[PDB]
Structure 1
Amino acid sequence: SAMGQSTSNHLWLLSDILGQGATANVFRGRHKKTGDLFAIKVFNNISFLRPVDVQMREFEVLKKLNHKNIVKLFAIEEETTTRHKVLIMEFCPCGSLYTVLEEPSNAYGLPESEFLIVLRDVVGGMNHLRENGIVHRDIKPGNIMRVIGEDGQSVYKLTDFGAARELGTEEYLHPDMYEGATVDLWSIGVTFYHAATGSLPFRPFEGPRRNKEVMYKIITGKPSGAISGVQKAENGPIDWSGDMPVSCSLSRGLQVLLTPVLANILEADQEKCWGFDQFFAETSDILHRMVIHVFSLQQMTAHKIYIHSYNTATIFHELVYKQTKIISSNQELIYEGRRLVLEPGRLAQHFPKTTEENPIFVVSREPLNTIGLIYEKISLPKVHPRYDLDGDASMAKAITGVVCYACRIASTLLLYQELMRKGIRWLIELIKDDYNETVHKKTEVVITLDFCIRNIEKTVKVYAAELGEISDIHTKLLRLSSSQGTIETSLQDIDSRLSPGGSLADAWAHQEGTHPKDRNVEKLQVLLNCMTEIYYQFKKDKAERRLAYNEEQIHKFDKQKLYYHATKAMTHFTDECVKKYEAFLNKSEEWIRKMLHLRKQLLSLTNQCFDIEEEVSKYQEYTNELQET
Structure 2
Amino acid sequence: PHIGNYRLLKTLGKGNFAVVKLARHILTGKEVAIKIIDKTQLNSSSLQKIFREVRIMKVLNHPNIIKLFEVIETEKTLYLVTEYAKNGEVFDYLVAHGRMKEKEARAKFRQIVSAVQYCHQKFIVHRDLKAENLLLDADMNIKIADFGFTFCGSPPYAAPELFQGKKYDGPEVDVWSLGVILYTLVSGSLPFDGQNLKELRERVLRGKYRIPFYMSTDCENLLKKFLILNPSKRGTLEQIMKDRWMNVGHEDDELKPYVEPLPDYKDPRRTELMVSMGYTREEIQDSLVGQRYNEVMATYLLLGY
CA distance in structure 1 between the aligned counterparts of 2:59 and 2:193, rounded to whole angstroms: 40
1:10, 1:29 within 8 Å by CA — same for their partners in 2? yes
| 1:39 Cα deviation from its structure 2 partner | 0.7
C-alpha displacement at 1:181, in angstroms? 2.4
Q: How does 1:241-390 map to 2 (within 5 A)?
A: 241=210, 243=211, 245-246=212-213, 248=214, 255-282=216-243, 285-290=244-249, 308=251
Shift of 1:163: 5.4
Counterpart in the other structure of 1:93:
86
CA distances 1:362-420 after superposition (whole Å, capped 9, x unpaired)? xxxxxxxxxxxxxxxxxxxxxxxxxxxxxxxxxxxxxxxxxxxxxxxxxxxxxxxxxxx
The Cα shift of 1:57 comes to: 7.5
Give the drift of 1:126.
1.0
- What does residue 302 of structure 2 align with? none
Using the TM superposition, give the Cα deviation of residue 286 of structure 1 relative to its aligned residue in structure 2, in angstroms.
2.8
- C-alpha deviation, 1:11, in angstroms: 3.6
The 2-side partners of 1:200 and 1:145 are apart by 18
Which amino acid in 1 is paired with 2:89? S
Which consecutive unaligned segments of at least 5 residues does structure 1 have?
229-240, 292-307, 311-629
| Whole-angstrom distance in 1 between the partners of 2:171 and 2:219 | 21
- 2:51 & 2:66 partners in 1: Cα distance? 19
- The answer for the alignment partner of 1:156 in structure 2 is 142
Q: Would the aligned equivalents of 1:27 and 1:41 in 2 still touch at CA under 8 Å? A: yes
What are the superposed Cα offsets for residues 42-87 of structure 1, whole Å, 9 maximum, x if unpaired? Answer: 22464444898996586355235322111101011136xx831110
Say if 1:7 and 1:78, in contact at 8 Å, map to a contact too: no
Higher RCO, 1 or 2 (CA under 8 Å, sep at least 6)? Answer: 2
Distance 1:193 1:77 in 2: 39
More helix by share: 1
Q: Residue 94 of structure 1 contacts residue 148 of structure 1 at CA under 8 Å; is this kept in 2?
A: yes
Structure 2 unmatched ranges of 5 or more = 254-305
1:214 alignment counterpart: 199
Relative distance call for 1:185 and 1:60 in structure 2 (3 A) is closer
1:183 aligned counterpart, secondary structure: helix
The aligned runs of 1:76-225 (5 Å cut-off) are: 76-78=71-73, 83-103=76-96, 105-106=97-98, 109-149=99-139, 154-162=140-148, 169-178=154-163, 180-204=170-194, 207=195, 211-222=196-207
SS of the equivalent of 2:184 reads helix
Give the direction of change, closer, same or farther, for the CA distance of 1:6–1:258 in structure 2 (3 Å limit). Answer: same
Q: Which amino acid aligns with 2:24?
A: R
| Residue pair 1:94, 1:145 contacting (<8 A) in 2 also | yes
Aligned length: 245
Letter in structure 1 aligned against 2:198: E
Tell me what 2:5 maps to.
9
Change (3 A) 1:274 1:21: farther
Matching of residues 442-591 of structure 1 within 5 Å? none
The aligned residue for residue 323 of structure 1 is: none
Shift of 1:131: 1.2
CA RMSD of aligned residues (A): 3.1
Counterpart selection for 1:74 from 69, 72, 95: 69
Question: Do 1:137 and 1:185's aligned partners in 2 also have CA atoms closer than 8 Å?
Answer: no
Distance 2:175 2:16 in 1: 25
Deviation for aligned residue 1:34: 4.1
Sequence identity percentage: 27
CA 1:47–1:218 in 2, change beyond 3 Å: closer, same or farther? closer
Paired residue secondary structure (1:17):
strand
Aligned to 1:28: 22
Code of the aligned partner of 1:218: R
Deviation at 1:111, TM superposition (A): 2.5
What SS does structure 1 have at the residue aligned with 2:33? strand
TM-score, normalization by structure 2: 0.70
- Find the aligned partners of 2:191 and 2:53 in 1 and give their Cα distance: 35
CA apart distance, 1:20: 4.7
**Deviation at 1:261?**
1.7
* One-letter identity of the residue aligned with 1:177: L
The answer as to whether partners of 1:63 and 1:75 remain within 8 angstroms in 2 is no
Task: Specify the alignment match of 1:436 in structure 2.
Answer: none
Q: Distance in 2 between matches of 1:214 and 1:52?
A: 34
Deviation at 1:139, TM superposition (A): 1.4
Deviates more, 1:17-26 or 1:259-268: 17-26
- Map Cα deviations across residues 282-312 of structure 1 (whole Å, 9 max, x no partner): 2xx4333338xxxxxxxxxxxxxxxx569xx
Tell me the distance in 2 between the aligned counterparts of 1:94 and 1:183.
27
Give the TM-score normalised by the residue count of structure 1.
Answer: 0.36
**1:195/1:58 CA distance change after superposition, 3 Å:** closer
- SS of alignment partner, residue 143 of structure 2: strand
Q: Confirm or deny that 1:39 pairs with 2:18.
A: no
